[PDB]
Design a protein around this ligand. Structure first.
Ligand SMILES: Cc1cc(C)nc(Sc2c(F)c(F)c(S(N)(=O)=O)c(F)c2F)n1
Ligand SMILES: [Zn+2]
Length: 257
């Protein structure tokens, strides 16, 4: 039932998923002046050299690039984290227009899109059990602005016409997610939630300070996807972002400045 329209969009989600009005929901606006520098935060460790992508999937909300997470091959650790989190999939949220699309905002600024690299804590053995735990996931969020193309994004963009509609998948091997990372790993971090139902409060968010730039041609090709299944009326997959939620009793920490 849930989605991103007038009738089933984010302001409706609480009726199926009451935790939507919970105490640690995401995304949030990152007010950069009030984020606390924490000199004891460590550098983020991104170890993606052995990443095994497998498939790319249009699940009707976004598209996910899935990885083999049955061994420690693409892991995130250090930063604010204890122990080791395995990359399971990434996806993006984007707008109908370049002026919107990101879920987190920075001093109320919206970016054209936001990439989420989703990782689960190995001490919980799999994704499904990790999401039930308050330290189960670590999501690395990277903003996209439109400008020069991101060469490392182009293989994703080029396969989109093969998974246009909900339920479609395609083989997607040998994709290297290092090609999507900006130069700096300076980050902000706070405890939050999944930004789509079930909205579970299991995520340590790590949002990079530096956006990557992608071309208008790349993000236009995101907007040609469809939220519908094949043979259903065309509904463009645009504006699949949840707006900022109340910070409540949380402090956003910065690894820098
Ligand atoms: C209980 C359960 C089971 C399964 C298989 N997926 C999930 S989904 C999920 C989700 F709902 C999210 F919002 C996010 S996110 N956008 O990066 O915050 C996510 F990464 C996810 F992987 N939840
Ligand atoms: Zn997401």
């Amino acid at each position: 039932h849930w989605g991103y329209g007038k009738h089933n969009g984010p302001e409706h989600w609480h009726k199926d998923f009451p935790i939507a009005k919970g105490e640690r929901q995401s995304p949030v606006d990152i007010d950069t002046h009030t984020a606390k520098y924490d000199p004891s935060l460590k550098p983020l460790s991104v170890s993606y050299d052995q990443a095994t992508s497998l498939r790319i999937l249009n699940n009707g909300h976004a598209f996910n690039v899935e990885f083999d997470d049955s061994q420690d091959k693409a892991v995130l650790k250090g930063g604010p984290l204890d122990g080791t989190y395995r990359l399971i999939q990434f996806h993006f949220h984007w707008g109908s227009l370049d002026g919107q699309g990101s879920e987190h905002t920075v001093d109320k600024k919206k970016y054209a899109a936001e990439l989420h690299l989703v990782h689960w804590n190995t001490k919980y053995g799999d994704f499904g059990k990790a999401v039930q735990q308050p330290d189960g996931l670590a999501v690395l969020g990277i903003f996209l602005k439109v400008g020069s193309a991101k060469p490392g994004l182009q293989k994703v963009v080029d396969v989109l016409d093969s998974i246009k509609t909900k339920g479609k998948s395609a083989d997607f091997t040998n994709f290297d997610p290092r090609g999507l990372l900006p130069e700096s790993l300076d980050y902000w971090t706070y405890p939050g939630s999944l930004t789509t139902p079930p909205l579970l409060e299991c995520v340590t968010w790590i949002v990079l300070k530096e956006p990557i730039s992608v071309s208008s041609e790349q993000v236009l090709k995101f907007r040609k996807l469809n939220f519908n299944g094949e043979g259903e009326p065309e509904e463009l997959m645009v504006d699949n972002w949840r707006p900022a939620q109340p910070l409540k009793n949380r402090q956003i920490k910065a690894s820098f400045k």
